[PDB]
Amino acid sequence: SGFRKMAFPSGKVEGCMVQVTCGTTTLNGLWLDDVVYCPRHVISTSEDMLNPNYEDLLIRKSNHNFLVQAGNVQLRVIGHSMQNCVLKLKVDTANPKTPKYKFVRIQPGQTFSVLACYNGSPSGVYQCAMRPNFTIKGSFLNGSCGSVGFNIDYDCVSFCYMHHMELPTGVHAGTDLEGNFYGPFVDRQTAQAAGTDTTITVNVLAWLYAAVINGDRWFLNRFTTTLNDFNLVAMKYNYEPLTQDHVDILGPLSAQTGIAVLDMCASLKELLQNGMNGRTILGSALLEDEFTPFDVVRQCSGVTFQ
Amino acid sequence: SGFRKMAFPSGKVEGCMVQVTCGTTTLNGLWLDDVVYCPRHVISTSEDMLNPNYEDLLIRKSNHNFLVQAGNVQLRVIGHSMQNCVLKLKVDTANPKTPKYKFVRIQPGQTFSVLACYNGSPSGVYQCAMRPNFTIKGSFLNGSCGSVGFNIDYDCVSFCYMHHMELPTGVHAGTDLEGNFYGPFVDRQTAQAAGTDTTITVNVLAWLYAAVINGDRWFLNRFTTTLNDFNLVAMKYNYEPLTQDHVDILGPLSAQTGIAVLDMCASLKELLQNGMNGRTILGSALLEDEFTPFDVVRQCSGVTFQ
């Protein structure tokens, strides 16, 4: 029983974390088969231009200008490349602890586990979600650049995020490991807007189903309605519109305890006009929106990763 | 920048998790140098859970009885003993993944990270705390016994918990690695409700400081309160008594933020009677008591002006 905010076991990712230094800038890097992946802004943030020119900053650099350190033993760089935001340092030594991995880009509403690293040493692991404004509300300090977010599929660390910079709002932005930034962001230091953040309704519905799996119903009432009878309600309460594809993926959770996904929406509506404040909703008062339907199944079924 | 419920990297613990099977019961085990630590009750039988005589059952079992698997490879047991609640299984193969470790018994209110495992493979990692009633609020399904809780100090895993049972109220009970339960619990079939969960005051005070170092200062403290009269209101609100030792550990956060320990106590009273009315302390509407002062300093490492 119980329901916590779980994160994936980070063991397979801890063995890939190295330290990348170019000049005086030092951040983290991901050591896959024989390539080290790190944000490209390790090559130009020592002279503090506020607008680095990464196209010409890399041509001058040679292989010996970089310094990849795998904890203790130094790594030889035998080639460098840049894929639109990230630096690929070709290394001579293949990482023996490379797991099965794949690069995948996530959509807003998806969740992943972040491994905060400093100087190549992992410090903590936490689970977060990709907000609709293409930002993440994580916990990063200076020197955490290069930290990655990931999921696991039976052995397969699907990397989906790499931390690049922090927005003035306090939220954090980054790219996928192909390089493309999540949202309209640039790796330069110019001030950029965070965007409009909306609570994820599809994750809220899944979270409410997790309460009735371990068992706390406490709100199921008031005249089950249809899809469009809740989209306009979400507009007023800052929540995002609910699509039918969200209902489609809410099937298994509805096909376990509840009657229909439509029934869950009606009870959620009263949770907006009214507040609990006397009995927590299985973890707290405020509604949590960082639990995808796929995360609830994983935690309630005890899925492991070998 | 940012504050989240992070857990320690579970990489070093995953390398110590094995699967222990005793005839018909299967749970997890902690594979240290040449001893596999798993909860006793693995040798017990469903028909004999009324009042198991573990000493009598341990004699009936031999080394060939215990089936220890480190993934796909079997470990041969060459001895079996019992530290009154755990089953030390002497094995022939020394674990090469053993990190520097030590068995520590934590006090109520201290936090640790839990690596939930099933059939010897990890499922997820999350952060929780030992509640004052000597129970934890975790997420465990059947077969999670043997999952351990731990902390890391820069090179060393401090094992402090091993999961044994789930109480009927939804909370979980376990032992230290030396085989001693936290609280009035035994591995039998008696009721064991464990009673009256209490809120941790030293942790919530630290959590209130975390909001200060992240852009939340609207819980202004006007007056102050001494050590005793603070406990006058902390007995009816069901809060852990605050001691001068708790003030000493809160010293570094008091100096870093400039708010005195006694001053912050008076700030809590405004949030109690008046409620929220839309007030969210940086992460939720309710108070969080699973952040020790050490966790706050660890995560948002500020500076102290003196």
Author numbering:
A (entry chain A), B (entry chain C): 1 to 306
Sentences from the paper on this structure:
The SARS-CoV-2 main protease (Mpro), a cysteine protease with essential functions in viral replication, has been validated as an effective drug target. Mpro is a cysteine protease that contains a catalytic dyad consisting of the nucleophilic cysteine 145 (C145) and histidine 41 (H41). It proteolytically processes the viral polyproteins pp1a and pp1ab at no less than 11 cleavage sites, and thereby also ensures its own release. In this work, we demonstrate that the SARS-CoV-2 Mpro is subject to redox regulation in vitro and contains multiple redox switches including a disulfide-dithiol switch between the catalytic residue C145 and C117, as well as a SONOS switch of residues C22, C44 and K61.
Specifically, an allosteric SONOS bridge consisting of two cysteines (C22, C44) and one lysine (K61) within one protein chain was detected by our mining of the protein data base and independent structural studies of Liu and coworkers. C44 is close in sequence to catalytic residue H41 and located on a flexible loop (residues 44-53). It points either towards the active site and contacts Y54 (“in” conformation) or towards the protein surface (“out” conformation). Variant C44S exhibits the lowest residual activity (16%), while variant C117S is slightly more active (42% residual activity). The markedly reduced activity of variant C44S comes not unexpected as residue C44 is very close to catalytic residue H41. A full kinetic Michealis-Menten analysis indicates that the reduction in activity of variant C44S is due to a decreased catalytic constant (kcat) rather than impaired substrate binding. Interestingly, variant Y54F, in which the tyrosine that interacts with SONOS residue C44 is replaced, shows a similar catalytic deficiency (19%) as variant C44S suggesting that both residues are required for full catalytic competence of the active site.
